[PDB]
Amino acid sequence: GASKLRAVLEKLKLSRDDISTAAGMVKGVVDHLLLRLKCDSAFRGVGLLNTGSYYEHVKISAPNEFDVMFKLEVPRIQLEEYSNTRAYYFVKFKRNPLSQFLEGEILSASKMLSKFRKIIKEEINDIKDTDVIMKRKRGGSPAVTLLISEKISVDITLALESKSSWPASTQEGLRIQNWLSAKVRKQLRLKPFYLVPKHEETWRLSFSHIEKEILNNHGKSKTCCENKEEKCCRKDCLKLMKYLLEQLKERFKDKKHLDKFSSYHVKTAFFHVCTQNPQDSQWDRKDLGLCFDNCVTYFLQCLRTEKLENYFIPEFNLFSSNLIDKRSKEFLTKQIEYERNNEFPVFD
Amino acid sequence: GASKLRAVLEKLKLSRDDISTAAGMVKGVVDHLLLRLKCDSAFRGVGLLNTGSYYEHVKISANEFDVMFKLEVPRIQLEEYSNTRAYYFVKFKNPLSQFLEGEILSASKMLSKFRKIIKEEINDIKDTDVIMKRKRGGSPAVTLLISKISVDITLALESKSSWPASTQEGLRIQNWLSAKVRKQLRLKPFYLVPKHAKEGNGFQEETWRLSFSHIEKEILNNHGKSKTCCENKEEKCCRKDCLKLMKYLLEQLKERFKDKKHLDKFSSYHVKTAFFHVCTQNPQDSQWDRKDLGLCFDNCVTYFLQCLRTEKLENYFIPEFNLFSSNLIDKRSKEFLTKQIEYERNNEFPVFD
Numbered sequence A: 001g002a003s004k005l006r007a008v009l010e011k012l013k014l015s016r017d018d019i020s021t022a023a024g025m026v027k028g029v030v031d032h033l034l035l036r037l038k039c040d041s042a043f044r045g046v047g048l049l050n051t052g053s054y055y056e057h058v059k060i061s062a063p064n065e066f067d068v069m070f071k072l073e074v075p076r077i078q079l080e081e082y083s084n085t086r087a088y089y090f091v092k093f094k095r096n097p098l099s100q101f102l103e104g105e106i107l108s109a110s111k112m113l114s115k116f117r118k119i120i121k122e123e124i125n126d127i128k129d130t131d132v133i134m135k136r137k138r139g140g141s142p143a144v145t146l147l148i149s150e151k152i153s154v155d156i157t158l159a160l161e162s163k164s165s166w167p168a169s170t171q172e173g174l175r176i177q178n179w180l181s182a183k184v185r186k187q188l189r190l191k192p193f194y195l196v197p198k199h200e201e202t203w204r205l206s207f208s209h210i211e212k213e214i215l216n217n218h219g220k221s222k223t224c225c226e227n228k229e230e231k232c233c234r235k236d237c238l239k240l241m242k243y244l245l246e247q248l249k250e251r252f253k254d255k256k257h258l259d260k261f262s263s264y265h266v267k268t269a270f271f272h273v274c275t276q277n278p279q280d281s282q283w284d285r286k287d288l289g290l291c292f293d294n295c296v297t298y299f300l301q302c303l304r305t306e307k308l309e310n311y312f313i314p315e316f317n318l319f320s321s322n323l324i325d326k327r328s329k330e331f332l333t334k335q336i337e338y339e340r341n342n343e344f345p346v347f348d
Numbered sequence B: 001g002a003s004k005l006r007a008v009l010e011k012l013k014l015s016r017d018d019i020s021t022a023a024g025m026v027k028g029v030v031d032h033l034l035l036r037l038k039c040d041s042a043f044r045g046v047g048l049l050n051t052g053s054y055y056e057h058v059k060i061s062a063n064e065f066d067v068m069f070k071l072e073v074p075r076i077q078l079e080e081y082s083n084t085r086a087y088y089f090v091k092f093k094n095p096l097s098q099f100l101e102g103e104i105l106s107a108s109k110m111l112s113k114f115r116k117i118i119k120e121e122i123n124d125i126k127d128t129d130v131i132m133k134r135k136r137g138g139s140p141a142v143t144l145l146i147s148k149i150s151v152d153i154t155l156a157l158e159s160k161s162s163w164p165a166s167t168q169e170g171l172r173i174q175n176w177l178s179a180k181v182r183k184q185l186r187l188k189p190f191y192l193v194p195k196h197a198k199e200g201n202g203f204q205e206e207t208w209r210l211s212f213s214h215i216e217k218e219i220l221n222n223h224g225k226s227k228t229c230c231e232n233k234e235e236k237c238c239r240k241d242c243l244k245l246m247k248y249l250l251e252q253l254k255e256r257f258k259d260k261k262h263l264d265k266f267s268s269y270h271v272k273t274a275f276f277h278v279c280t281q282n283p284q285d286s287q288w289d290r291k292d293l294g295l296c297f298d299n300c301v302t303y304f305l306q307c308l309r310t311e312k313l314e315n316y317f318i319p320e321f322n323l324f325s326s327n328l329i330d331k332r333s334k335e336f337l338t339k340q341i342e343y344e345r346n347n348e349f350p351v352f353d
């Protein structure tokens, strides 16, 4: 039932105050860390990146769990693609404050994360009612997790910033020309790109700032959602997709079959649905039920075909069997089909 | 009559190549001048502002270019001059210390320094000369003479603070380009150009005037309600062509009546301002369908005429500043331009022959 989707959206709206006060607590701690980090010669150019579901207004997860990125301005770097993977790179320099992090010619993610982690842990000791845990088994990103007031969790990810042209692997990505326009695609591609440490001393491409821009400025019409005539359901469809997946992951947290899926998979599928449906009239709020059904159906088709390209790097298949086994896709496919056939009881 | 408008537009297009190679000649000289300028401690933050009719793709009449040099400076505090809404004294909340006169930044001293270093560096660049631009209140400050090509150069201080209060009700693009876009543009810097606020000696010699030329460029080059306006055949509009035709109509009338003083105070900025107001009044892309170029241009002309008859043409960014005030343009000049435009319109624009 379409009205059951609206009921979910209504209740997700109720967490807005708690997300906002928690975010205010996070900002105060993060601002103090950045000021202390800036005092170190290697991290002088550190800053907040201001990305993630909170800033996209699509935060449906726990109000006590945030993800923040610290960006670091770097000398003009030279990238070397690792093993034709299109998304992972070694970082070298064309010409250095990060010299202490070099391992031969390449920038060591291990050495940089070590100092990043040590400074944060030292500085958290002088912040009232805050502790820090090293995030393990994520290849280095996120690097640390803060615990604020014994209530709020903050995953912190380090990201190198490069103002160079985007790597060649992105040349055919971000296929927004028929939706957001060729002019916008060109303007976005003039923005920096980021590299997060992600296991070899490899770094992985990140475009979280571009995803935020697209989600918050999402219509073909510049006035999309700014008046009653132009209210669309794009952002509500994404919230519902994220909530469906999170609810199913929670329901089967015991079993192992859904642990490899993440919000990024549904977010990526959603961007492809936007490419496939570029007109605002295809997203009329009065058709929220059908729009969500088509979003679910698209995600199911990705699962069944085992194809879900990174929206920026089309040759990187998030649904490769190297990343997610076939049985996990089959399990999630069956669970979602069951839910959809029964008007989503996991939403009850 | 619409086909005659298209004939004008096609002929204006023939000058694209010559504008481009001349613009390339200018870019080389300006780039070298800026590199030399940035060696001076006061102008370390100098840069090219990518504004003007060329960058807007609407350069119609004339080998003559206008360019702006932006200057990053420390945090500025503004003092409005005589309720003029557009003219300010500049104070600082310092590289420009030698150009203060008391608490305020002297436009006179800044121009003298700007003109000196330009004249110094041009002495090395061969096949380029510079003369002082006079009787424009300080903006433009100089004119470069390259090889056939003239380049007016304006100095523009950059302020990254919130825009002045006088702009609070301007830039009324919310129903056309969106409230989100208006917010994003108002987060961009604004500029101040040295500009005498009134004739005569005194405090009026040290004022600076608000400039939003970069915002005008952004809106003109990204002008549709639809992000894909003019990017495909279904969404071709005639906004930019209407502006070109309005500017060409004024330029041709100013040339035809160069023996009078009536049209001397009108400039392309008046029709550009009127055009932005017409875009506010007609916010939907379907109102600008290329099939209706003739009617769209007629409606642009009509709007300009109404501004003339009512003696009201607010600055698009500063709504309390009336470009058509009697203090700036006398009634008889507005009436003369009104009559000549009406004659042209009634006769299928003989100035476009």
Ligand SMILES: O=C(N[C@H]1CCCC[C@H]1C(=O)O)c1cnn2c(O)cc(-c3ccccc3)nc12
Binding pocket: A087, A204, A205, A206, A207, A208, A262, A263, A264, A265, A310, A313, A316, A318, A323
């Ligand atoms: O959760 C995320 N990803 C997981 C699911 C996809 C495979 C990696 C997983 C992981 O690294 O944990 C994820 C959250 N943001 N983000 C992002 O901005 C980029 C990428 C990405 C992925 C592949 C290639 C290049 C970039 N992933 C993410």
Ligand SMILES: O=C(N[C@H]1CCCC[C@H]1C(=O)O)c1cnn2c(O)cc(-c3ccccc3)nc12
Binding pocket: B086, B209, B210, B211, B212, B213, B267, B268, B269, B270, B315, B318, B321, B323, B328
């Ligand atoms: O030609 C231009 N202006 C003439 C016609 C209007 C009155 C002043 C005239 C002059 O200064 O010569 C003009 C070209 N750009 N530009 C601009 O970017 C801003 C302004 C402006 C005007 C009034 C108040 C605040 C700003 N004018 C211009």
Ligand SMILES: [Zn+2]
Binding pocket: A218, A219, A224, A225, A230, A231, A232, A233, A234
């Ligand atoms: Zn919308």
Ligand SMILES: [Zn+2]
Binding pocket: B223, B224, B229, B230, B235, B236, B237, B238, B239
């Ligand atoms: Zn257009």
